[PDB]
Every structure is written in C-alpha cells, then in structure tokens.
Paper text:
We next solved the structure of LdGDP-MP in the absence of any cofactor or substrate at the resolution of 3.4 Å using single-particle cryo-EM imaging technique, which comprises of six subunits and exhibits a D3 symmetry with a dimension of ~104 Å × ~104 Å × ~108 Å. The homoheximeric LdGDP-MP complex is organized as a dimer of trimers, with each subunit pinched by two neighboring subunits via two interacting regions, namely, interface-1 and interface-2. In interface-1, the two subunits are attached in a shape-complementary manner between the region around the canonical signature motif GGXGXR(L)XPLX5PK of pyrophosphorylases (PPases)8 in one protomer and the C-terminus of another protomer; whereas interface-2 formation is mediated exclusively by the two C-terminal domains crossed at ~70 degrees. The contact surfaces for interface-1 and interface-2 amount to ~590 Å2 and ~750 Å2, respectively; and the interactions are established predominantly by hydrophobic interactions together with a few hydrogen bonds. Strikingly, replacement of R23 with alanine (R23A) caused loss of ~77% activity, whereas the mutations of P364N365 to arginines (PN), deletion of the last three residues on the C-terminus (ΔIIM), their combination (PN&ΔIIM), or deletion of the entire C-terminal domain (C-del) rendered the enzyme completely inactive, indicating the essential role of interprotomer communication in attaining leishmanial GDP-MP activity. On the other hand, disruption of the interface-1 contacts led to instability of the quaternary organization, as evidenced by drastic changes in the oligomerization status.
Author numbering:
A (entry chain B), B (entry chain D): 191 to 196, 201 to 250, 256 to 379
C-alpha cells in the first residue's frame, strides 16, 4: 500500500522493477464470465469440475419426480420437480421450486429460481428469468436470455432473442434481436 | 350420348337450349381438393360430417395406448399406438401401424401409413409421407408436405417446406421452399 493519486494498474512495472513479482501457473480452466455466451461456456467448463464438490449409469440426478434420463452431468436443485419423461441434457442447471413438464429437453441451459415449463419444449444453450413462466410446446434455442417474469405462449420459437423484464411474447422470432 | 367430335362442356348451352336441364341445391360442404392447403381445409370441414359414419367428454378416440387427450374430433386408426401423454389436436387423421411418441401435438395434421414420431414434436397443419420417420423434438408447422420415406433429425424446424421422396433433412428452414 502506497499513496498513488491518479496508476499503472497496481504499479506492476515498478513491482517488476524491484523484482518481487511472482506468478503461479494454473492447470485449471479460466475464462471471464462477462457475456451470456461466455456464461454458457463457463458453465459447460465448470460443471465437470464439481464432481467432488457438491451432491450432484449417469447418477448426477436421475429420479426426482419420475423416471427421467440425464445424458450428462447436471445440477438439479433438490426441491425442483422434473416430471415423468424429461431429458436433462449435458451441463444444465435448475433452480429451487422449478417445475419441468412431463417431457422436456433442457440442453446446456440454465433455469433460475421459480419457473414453470410446459410439455415438449426445448431449451438449448439459453437462460431463463427468475419468475419466468414458459409455454408448453415452445422451442427456445441459441444464445437467448429471458428477463424476469416473462411469459411465452404455446408454440413459439425464440432463436437468440433477448426479452426485457415483464414483457410478453406470442410471436415467432427466427433472427437475433431484442423484444421490448 | 351423341357423337360430337372435338367439347363445349359436354354441350351444356344447347342442353339448356332445349330446356331439359335441372339443378339440385346442396346444403353440405363442397370444395376442390387440388392443393395441400385445400387438402387441409377439406379435412377440417369433412371430419365433423363423419360423426354418424365411422366408429371414430371428447370420445372420438381417447384411450388407445395410454391416457392421452384429444381436443376435438379426429380419426385414429385402431392399429396405431398413440403413446402416453400425446395431445391429438382438432381434425387430425392417423394411418395404420403409425407410432406416436410419449408426448406429441398432432394439430390439424394427417399422418399416413407406417410412420414413427419421437417425443415432444409438433405437427401443425401439415402432412407426412407414407414410410416417413420423424425425429424426436422437431417442429413441423404451416403447410408443409413431406414425401415418401423422408427422415428428419432431432430438433429441426420445417416451416412450410415440401421435401422430395427419399431425401434427408437435418437443417432448419424458416422460409417456404423446396428441398431436393
């Protein structure tokens, strides 16, 4: 600690000038989670590193509310209900009290907090809001982030579109964009 | 029968000229099934007229292979297997030996002869081939006709595209067109 009014970061050039700066090589993964794409990539790199950390034949989480199959490792919150014939894809996370329909596909996607999901939808490489209420037969794929308390009708196809909070969606979007 | 070498609509002007032509007014439906769109419209007008004709609380066909729900009247071939949680939409037809997945949406669509359908797909206002083999989580909607012995991979979205026989589809199509 030295009083340096505005500042070469932490005075690193001088730190090397007196030659007391050391480096520690890391064998593990490293990436900056600053974007939704980087968010998904960090999740898919970080999930396998938690095998010895937390509680969760692929037995990361297999029988919660019914006989469903998980292709790869995933984080299933114990209070959640998965359904009867869902297929939780590789490297997926699900929050507390989340409800997943009778048959679903959660592929490399994150479901946060209290969310309801219908029957037959596919959530691929995407994120959903906190109190999100998702339709039954929709199709959400690519890097699309859904804000808080959004709702989508049945049979909508959001492909890489970010929606703002409290909005409502009822129409297809086949191109990247933003919904206000 | 009179020998008229070539043509005037079987000589209807003269037929009326001798004044021996009668007409019968029809109270029922009538339309020319010459296009897939007209095919779908004729099906949706003709299905309700068969309530007293053939064998098939909405009890047109309710329990075949599992406890599934039918929203409206539909024609389910007895040899078919519907699944466990399918939702056969209004005015749909299914051919013999057809297999429908655990949860499906057959909405105003026709399935012809031996076809297999995965889990969670949606077939809306469309037709499928004879020996068609449909993927699991696909999404086929709008007026799209699939030829004979076509196959679609998982998670494809065909929106109003007509595919030729024996072809294979593995990529999305968000616009009307033809696949060779």
């Amino acid at each position: 600690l030295d009083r340096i009014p505005p500042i070469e970061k932490e005075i690193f050039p001088a730190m090397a000038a007196e030659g007391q700066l050391y480096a520690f090589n890391l064998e593990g993964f490293w990436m900056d989670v600053g974007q939704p794409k980087d968010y998904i990539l960090g999740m898919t790199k970080f999930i396998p590193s938690l095998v010895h950390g937390n509680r969760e034949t692929e037995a990361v989480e297999h029988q919660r509310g019914g006989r469903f199959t998980v292709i790869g490792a995933s984080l299933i919150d114990p209070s959640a209900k998965i359904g009867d014939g869902a297929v939780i894809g590789p490297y997926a996370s699900i929050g507390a009290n989340c409800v997943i329909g009778e048959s679903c596909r959660i592929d490399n996607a994150a479901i946060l907090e209290n969310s309801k999901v219908g029957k037959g939808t596919m959530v691929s490489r995407s994120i959903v809001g906190w109190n999100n209420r998702i339709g039954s037969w929709c199709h959400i794929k690519d890097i699309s982030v859904l804000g808080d308390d959004v709702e989508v009708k049945d049979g909508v196809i959001l492909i890489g579109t970010k929606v703002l909070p409290n909005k409502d969606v009822g129409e297809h979007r086949f191109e990247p964009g933003i919904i206000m």
